[PDB]
């Protein structure tokens, strides 16, 4: 049900680090973020 600056931020950083170079450190962060949302989803 979430869709605030969180979703926007995730896509921003993800796409950035993605179209940039992406690093284990960064990738790890997005992990908990997306993993958390998925855990709560609806």
Swiss-Prot record:
Localization per Swiss-Prot or TrEMBL: Cytoplasm
GO terms under cellular component: cytoplasm
Keywords of this entry: Cytoplasm
Induction data: Repressed by LexA.
Main subcellular localisation: cytoplasm
Similarity remark: Belongs to the UPF0291 family.
Name of the featured protein: UPF0291 protein YnzC
Record organism: Bacillus subtilis (strain 168)
Residues included from the entire protein: 1 to 42 of 77
